[PDB]
Write a protein that binds this ligand. Sequence first.
Ligand SMILES: O=[N+]([O-])c1cc(C(F)(F)F)ccc1NCc1ccco1
Lengths: 115, 113
Amino acid sequence: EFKGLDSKTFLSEHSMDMKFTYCDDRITELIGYHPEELLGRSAYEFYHALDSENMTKSHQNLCTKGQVVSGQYRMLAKHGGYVWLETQGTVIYNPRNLQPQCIMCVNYVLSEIEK
Amino acid sequence: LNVCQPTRFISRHNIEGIFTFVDHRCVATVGYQPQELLGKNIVEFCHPEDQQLLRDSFQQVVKLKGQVLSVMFRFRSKNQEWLWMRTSSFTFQNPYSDEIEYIICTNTNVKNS
Ligand SMILES: O=[N+]([O-])c1cc(C(F)(F)F)ccc1NCc1ccco1
C-alpha cells in the first residue's frame, strides 16, 4: 500500500505538442501502462475528461514561462478509473536560437487508483 | 511533417554527478548501455578541457533551485570519439518531502565548434 517517493514519480518527455517521446517504467506499477504503448500518443488521451481543458491552460503557461506546476489532475489508468497526479513541466530550449526542443515532465502520484 | 529528431537521452544524477538513472536512448546517443554509465560520475566521460566547466555546472544547477541550466561539453562516446553534448539540467525534490534534491538532465548530441 504505502510506497516510497521514488516509486511514486515517473519521468516523461514530450514533443512540443504534448505527444510522448519517452516515459519511464515506473508508470507501470502506478497505473498500468507500459511506456512502449504510450509513445507517439498525445498526453490528452490520458487526461480525465474533467481536467482536459485545465491541462490545455497549464500547457499554455508552460510554453510562455518555460516551466509550470500543474494543478491536481486525474490521469486515466490502463484498466479504468484514474489516479490523481501533479506534474512539474520544464521546456528544454536550444540556447543558440531560443527554440523549444521538448518538454520534460516530472509526474508524481497523489492517490491510489479511484473510480 | 516528419523532421529529423535530435539524438538525446535523459539521465538523473546525484548532486556530485553520479548517474543514478539512464534512459536506454543512451545507446543510440553515445553507444553505452545504461549499466555502463550507472554508478559512474558524468565528469569521467567529459573531455579534460571541459571537466571544470561541467563540475561548475553541478554547483550552478543546485543554486538555481529548480531552474534549467544548459552546458555544452565534449562527451567520450563508446567508440572513443568526442561528441558535442548539450546538457540541460535542473534539480528536483518531491514537494511533499525534504529528501536531498537530485538533478534531471536531458543530453542531446548537437553541432558545435
Ligand atoms: O506532456 N505535457 O506537456 C504535460 C504537461 C503538463 C502540465 F500540466 F502542463 F504541467 C502535465 C503533464 C504532461 N504530460 C504528462 C502526462 C500526460 C498524460 C498524463 O500525464
